[PDB]
Each structure stands twice: as C-alpha cells, then as structure tokens.
Amino acid sequence: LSSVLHQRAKIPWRACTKYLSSAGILLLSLLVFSQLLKHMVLVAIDYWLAKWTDSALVCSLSQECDLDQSVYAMVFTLLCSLGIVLCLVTSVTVEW
C-alpha cells in the first residue's frame, strides 16, 4: 500500500478531541493562560535586568518606560516572586 504521505498525520485531531472531551473548558484555558503568563514574566525579568544594569551603571512602579529609580530591587524581587508563584501554579494545573 501507499501511506508515506498518509502516515504523517501529525495527530492534530487526536489532540483536539483529547483536550475537549477529557479536560473540559475551564482548566485547559487556565493552563494556557498560566504558561503564557509565566513565560512573559521570564521575558520581563530579563528585560528589567538588562535595563537595570544599563541605567544604574554609573513613581518607579511602572514595569517599562520609566528610568527614575536609584534602586531597582523592589521591582526585581517582585518579578522573581511572580515567577516562583507562577511555576507552582503551572505545575499544579498541568498535573491536575
């Protein structure tokens, strides 16, 4: 028989049905949102770290567009805490 092209199904339907008829709606959306939120924090922590070693190398609540802070510790510790908490939430959601 000829199935060289047929074999490469990639199982996309087998996954759509899986998530739908097994996970529901609430938890699948929570999983995706939690993963993206944690990864955006990683982007944010690297972006904030870069701008900090940049400006500090001799009203600051804003994450971006603000360069009026002698010390960047307050926002950087908060970003680290967000990353830890989101890792916990992401792990729980995936396993549950």
Binding site: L1, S2, S3, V4, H6, Q7
Partner: protein, 360 residues
C-alpha cells in the same frame, strides 16, 4: 532540564498479543527491475567495488565521459589555474628583483611595465595564450625570468595540446548518433513460413549510413541447471535467421528481425498463458556498427520484458512504391495487427507437426 528526564529506568510491563498492524506493506508496488532500459543505459548498479584508483588513472577517458558543461568548467579551470599560478610567479620574481617600486634610479627591470599584480596577471595571460602584446617584455637582466618563460611556454603548450586531444575525442563522440537508432517499443511472436519466430523491427532515422551493422540478441532468465547451478541472470545467445547465419545486416529501410524458434532455442517452451507481467524473462537487442562520418563504433541497446511482448500479432507493412522512389511511413513503425495463430507452445506445435506430417 526541559527534557523529560526522571526516575523511570525499569520499563517493566506486560503487553498483550498484537497482530495485523496497519502498515503500507500489503502489496509490492515495485515491479521487476529492467536489465537494460529502452534507451540503452543499463539499469544495473554495481556495489562493493574495491576501488584502486583505476577510475582516476585514466583521466583522459574520464574527461571524455564528462558532460559538456562540466568539461567547459574543467577546461576553464585548467587554463585559469595555470594562468594565475604563473601570474604569482612573475609577480613574485619581479617583486624580489626590486623592480616593482617605481623610481628614476639605476635599476633596470627584468620584466618591463610590471607595476602591480594586475599587470603581472595580464602578462601571464599574454605569455601562455601567446597573445604577446609586448608592452611588458622580458629583458636580459635576470636569467630566472628566461627559465620561467621557458617553463610557462612548455606548460601552456602541453595543456593546450592535451585539451585539444580531449576536444577531438569529445567532438568525435557518437553517443548522440546511437540515439537516432529506433527499435519498436513492443515486439511480437508470430508464425512465418509455418515456423514460429520472435519478430521485431529496427530502423534508422538519419541519412548517414551505419557501416557493418551487427544485431546480436540475448535472453536473460535465471537458470537452474540439472546439476543444480544458481545463475541469477544467465545470458543465452540468439540467432537472427539471416540467410547466411551471420549477424551482419544492411539497414536503410526499417527491417524486420526475427529469431526462428528451432529445436535449440531458449524460447522453445513459452506459452501465451505464461506471458504475464511478473514473468522472469527479457530479450536484449544489440545493434552495433561503425558510423560512416566519425568512424566511431556505436551500440544501441533495447529490452523487451514479458509484458512488452505481444503474441500472435504482425507488424504493419511500412514501405511503399511512390512516384520517384520508395517511401517509409514511420507513423506505422510500431503498429501491430492480430494474426490467426495457435496458442500452443513451440514444442506443442512441434508435436502437432510430428504427428500431422506423418500421415502414413
């Protein structure tokens, strides 16, 4: 580690019996491999060759086998490499001589007009291609220039002579004339003069005659001897039923070629009911002569598998007698029309003749 690496080395589990998996292996799509293709170009792949440089030893023969695009590139690379290498030599010798830094001084240049490497490259072109503009002469000053001039001239003449020889052997190539020899796509088995024979048609398209044509013919079947031998592809020779037995033939109009199936033929036990596609048989035809213009010998190769054969059909007559001369209507070259024939084997026909003829 992002990869799924954890504590699970055991992999101990019991799986039930599994049978009949879905896989693309129900049927073998690939057919029986052709021993030589319909345009020559035999479809046999050598393997496990213990190379010893014999391919590379005969560079000249290797150059001839190359296509014209690659031959032109090697032609170009050979000249360019020699030209540029000696350009460095001329540039370096002038630079070492010190006649490259300009000035109104006591020094007299060994090679005049050399100012940069560009002039050295142009001077190399002039010397080896014998253009000889003469604005960049060779003077009497440094004898090493005279030695290098002799070396460059000898090397240039040798490379020119070698490439000439290669081009003369490549413009005499007749592998593009052998492709105008035409064999009918499918051959037939049909009775002539009461004896069965394996007919065929071969014709020439151009007007330049091929001298001393020679039509051989071989049957390619796996053979198991009574002694038990195992020959995967045995090649049995085949006659041509010519009036003198010899393989020679004079081909102007497309002639009919047929192997009279006598008692000593390997086709002698073939029946139309066993002429399906997956039958291990093949008929090769070898039309070799010398082309009258180039004088170079040529071969034409064609093959006829089992499914290509067409039992009990006769080729359509092609030649006619028109006003000025004969005509050849090539549109009817491969047309076959069915003829009333027995379905018996050659040996079955022989048995029928053995009894019917001996009426008394």
């Amino acid at each position: 580690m992002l990869s799924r690496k954890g504590i699970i080395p055991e992999e101990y589990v019991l799986t039930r019996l599994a049978e009949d998996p879905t896989e693309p292996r129900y049927r073998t799509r690939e057919r029986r491999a052709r021993f030589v293709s319909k345009k020559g170009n035999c479809n046999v792949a050598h393997k496990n060759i213990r190379e010893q440089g014999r391919f590379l030893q005969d560079v000249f023969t290797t150059l001839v086998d190359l296509k014209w695009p690659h031959t032109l590139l090697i032609f170009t690379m050979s000249f360019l490499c020699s030209w540029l290498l000696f350009a460095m030599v001329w540039w370096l010798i002038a630079f070492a001589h010190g006649d490259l830094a300009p000035g109104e001084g006591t020094n007299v240049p060994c090679v005049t007009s050399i100012h940069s490497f560009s002039s050295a490259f142009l001077f190399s072109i002039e010397v080896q291609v014998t253009i000889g503009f003469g604005g960049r002469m060779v003077t009497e000053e440094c004898p090493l220039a005279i030695l290098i001039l002799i070396v460059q001239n000898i090397v240039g003449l040798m490379i020119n002579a070698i490439m000439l020889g290669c081009i003369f052997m490549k413009t005499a190539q007749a592998h593009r004339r052998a492709e105008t020899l035409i064999f009918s796509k499918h051959a037939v088995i049909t009775l002539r003069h009461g004896r069965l024979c394996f007919m065929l048609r071969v014709g020439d398209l151009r007007k330049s005659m091929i001298i001393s044509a020679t039509i051989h013919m071989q049957v390619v079947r796996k053979t198991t001897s009574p002694e038990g031998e195992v020959v995967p592809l045995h090649q049995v020779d085949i006659p041509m039923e010519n009036g003198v037995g010899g393989n020679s033939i004079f081909l102007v109009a497309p002639l009919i070629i047929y192997h009279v199936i006598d008692s000593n033929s390997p086709l002698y036990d073939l029946a139309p009911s066993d002429l399906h596609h997956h039958q291990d048989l093949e008929i090769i035809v070898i039309l070799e002569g010398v082309v009258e213009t180039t004088g170079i010998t040529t071969q034409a190769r064609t093959s006829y598998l089992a499914d290509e054969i067409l039992w009990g059909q006769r080729f359509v007559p092609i030649v006619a007698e028109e006003d000025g001369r004969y005509s050849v209507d090539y549109s009817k070259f491969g047309n076959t029309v069915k003829v009333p024939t027995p379905l018996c084997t050659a040996r079955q026909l022989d048995e029928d003749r053995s009894l019917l003829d001996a009426l008394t």
